[PDB]
Amino acid sequence: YQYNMNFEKLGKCIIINNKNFDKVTGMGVRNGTDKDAEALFKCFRSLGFDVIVYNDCSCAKMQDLLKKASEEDHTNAACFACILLSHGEENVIYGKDGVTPIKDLTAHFRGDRCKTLLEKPKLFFIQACRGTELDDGIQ
Amino acid sequence: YKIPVEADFLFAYSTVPGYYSWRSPGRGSWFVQALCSILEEHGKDLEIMQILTRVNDRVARHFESQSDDPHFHEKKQIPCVVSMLTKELYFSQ
């Protein structure tokens, strides 16, 4: 009933921290995101993840980053974790040069595309907008 | 013989589909703030769904946007957890 955590490594943790964006995208500087990144870095480190933080990535960079990670050998990892901090919209997330589908970033980890992570948990934490609706709260 | 290709994935979004996600320039986004405080105190002893549930509670209760624009004044936020996991997950032992 519990995932087996008896491996040498807990796993790799990729943190993508996008703060500054290309003028064309029209998105402003995500202030405070560095405080989040550092906080996330210490936490996941404590859990036991081998964390690495990439800054202001382009869509190709984010794409290549996740693709490579999926092609690495995770035979000794209990799991994998990825954290995306950035601007975003319904189903997509911003790279410093535009938008890219969140589906494309995670598909690289489907069981039929990363045998070493089969039956092992794949975690994705996303801090980004998903639309423009507001919640007014109640009572 | 098999296992579904989409199985064992877990997505923890900072907000529900179609909504805004808040971030404080001085303290960081609400989601990450709450996620780190819960993890820092229960990361090694709680199942991940328990942890993200408490993060949901903290973000929903402890926060309320503050802006000059009356249209963005006192707004709330609720995270969203999508799970395809097939077992309980603990970060220890």
């Binding site: 402003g28 995500r30 202030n31 405070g32 950035s86 601007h87 975003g88 801090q127 980004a128 907008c129 | 900072s14 805004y20 996600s21 808040w22 971030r23 404080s24 320039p25 986004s29 946007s65 503050q66 802006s67 000059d68 963005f72």
Partner: peptide
Amino acid sequence: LDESX
């Protein structure tokens, strides 16, 4: 003042 993502 809180900003959005």
